[PDB]
Ligand binder design. Structure first.
Ligand SMILES: CN(Cc1ccc2nccn2c1)c1nnc(-c2ccc(-c3ccccc3Cl)cc2)o1
Length: 270
């Protein structure tokens, strides 16, 4: 029955192409399109459709396998995979996601500094964003799933302004020191990317390490330098993000420890 569990997950993740109607292109690695998904209750749902790219057997079965694992995730701060579709060329898979009208968190932070879009984001909400990602990441690491592409651009905003982790890997300034050197990736490397993500949130969308080029990053970190404390950022919050960048990956806290520290800090605000 150990294999029968994979077959169960496999049947579940596939969506009939006829239940899907494709809309306009939102982004042009593969495309992001809007779509309509006909549900079991007879009504249509607005969805986001991600199309992907070379073998028509092994790599496709690999996509279905990976998608079957992804649809098994069930947490309010992890994007939910609604299912997958396949379309053949003259070998193009599609992944079906809930439509997020508020978009990615990175764009939202940037828009908040311009007169038109969202208004100034206060400290409590910036901390609520960090708690939400920590909760989603905590769910993932406890299931032994590595994100491998954690950044503000890969976190999505739901209609109730809840953040969910998304766009799972497969970005040099999000990569842990040991991942740049030993080409090794663990949950401590996700914790490092999370600290960088927290810094993007606190700076309201600044690119990490201003004045340091991508090809200078490994030598920069090797000499002990880390991301600087953002202006008006709490010392406690900075200590939490800094703890994510400890040279020894074993010294870095887990997501569960980080989530707790962030919740206490949030509750402590007036
Ligand atoms: C496109 N995107 C972001 C998004 C979401 C929602 C949204 N609404 C409007 C615009 N939007 C944009 C997104 N978030 N998560 C994913 C994703 C993509 C691929 C896979 C995957 C990769 C390999 C094998 C199997 C799978 Cl299922 C998993 C998750 O993509």
């Amino acid at each position: 029955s150990h294999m029968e569990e994979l077959q169960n997950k496999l049947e579940d993740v596939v969506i009939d192409r006829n239940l899907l109607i494709l809309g306009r292109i939102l982004g042009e690695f593969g495309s992001v399109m809007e779509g309509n998904l006909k549900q079991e209750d007879g009504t249509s749902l607005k969805v986001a459709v991600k199309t992907m790219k070379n073998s028509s057997q092994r790599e496709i079965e690999e996509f279905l396998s990976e998608a079957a694992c992804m649809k098994d995730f069930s947490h309010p701060n992890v994007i939910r995979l609604l299912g997958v579709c396949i379309e053949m060329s003259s070998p193009k898979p599609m992944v079906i996601l809930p439509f997020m009208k508020y978009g990615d968190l990175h764009t939202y932070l940037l828009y908040s500094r311009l007169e038109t879009g969202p208004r100034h984001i206060p400290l409590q909400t910036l901390l609520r964003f960090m708690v939400d990602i920590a909760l989603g990441m905590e769910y993932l690491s406890n299931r032994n799933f590595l994100h491998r592409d954690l950044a503000a651009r890969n976190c999505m905003l739901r209609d109730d302004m809840t953040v969910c982790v998304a766009d799972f890997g497969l970005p040099v300034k999000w990569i842990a020191i040991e991942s740049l050197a030993d080409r090794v990736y663990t949950s401590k490397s996700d914790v490092w990317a999370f600290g960088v993500t927290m810094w993007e949130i606190a700076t309201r969308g600044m690119t990490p390490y201003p004045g340091v080029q991508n090809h200078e990053m490994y030598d920069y970190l090797l000499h002990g330098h880390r991301l600087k404390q953002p202006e008006d950022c709490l010392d406690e919050l900075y200590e939490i993000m800094y703890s994510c960048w400890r040279t020894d990956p074993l010294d870095r806290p887990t997501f569960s420890v980080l989530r707790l520290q962030l919740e206490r800090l949030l509750e402590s605000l007036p």
